[PDB]
Amino acid sequence: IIRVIPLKMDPTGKLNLTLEGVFTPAEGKLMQSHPLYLCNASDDDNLEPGFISIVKLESPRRAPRPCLSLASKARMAGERGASAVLFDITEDRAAAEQLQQPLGLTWPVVLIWGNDAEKLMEFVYKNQKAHVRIELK
């Protein structure tokens, strides 16, 4: 579960989320991650360590072929100080069943299939962007 709890004060924002993570526990802050950013040609920013990367996937029907396997996708993310990795399959449940369901890796992989986690992505939009702390579960 990715509990919604931000560094800015908010009510009923405890357990402000409840999710699913089929491949360990860890807590840290959430950062967006453009889909095309997870590619070899992309320059690695490496801004600061101790963060969780949230990646949203679009529809694979109108979409052309990805640069790398969702596999190497999560892998590379590992290197990034982003210590955790989530993946959005709302408009792609094939990504839900994608690659070796098992985590050949260890950086906790947590897909969502969230009907309220896309609601939480609208939260990441928010009116104050984020400055939002993050809770695993």
Binding site: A41, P64, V124
Partner: protein, 102 residues
């Protein structure tokens, strides 16, 4: 509809594929990161053609404003001289009113 200058637009993560004659730049804010087609890369970046999709890339040489490629510069800061694509405090072995030096 579709964002201007983009042909595969999305309202969640931004444009996906721009026009075949235009570039896409990954402009990241403090929280989010949105790609934004644009006619030319900003001065700190340089153009990089590719048959599949174009993209702007940062340079790896310091004290350079605009650079031809990752291993070549064409304009440093208002200051130290330039020699064969390298910006140096003094003109090395070049014996050099332009800030050009060669």
């Amino acid at each position: 509809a579709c964002a201007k200058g983009c042909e595969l637009c999305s309202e969640v993560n931004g444009c996906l594929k721009c026009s075949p004659k235009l570039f896409i730049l990954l402009e990241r804010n403090d929280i989010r990161q949105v790609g934004v087609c644009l006619p030319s890369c900003p001065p700190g970046y340089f153009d990089a053609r590719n048959p599949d999709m174009n993209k702007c890339i940062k340079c790896k040489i310091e004290h350079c404003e605009a650079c031809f490629s990752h291993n070549f510069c064409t304009k440093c800061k208002e200051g130290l001289y330039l020699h064969k694509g390298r910006c140096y405090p003094a003109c090395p072995e070049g014996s050099s009113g332009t800030m050009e030096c060669s």
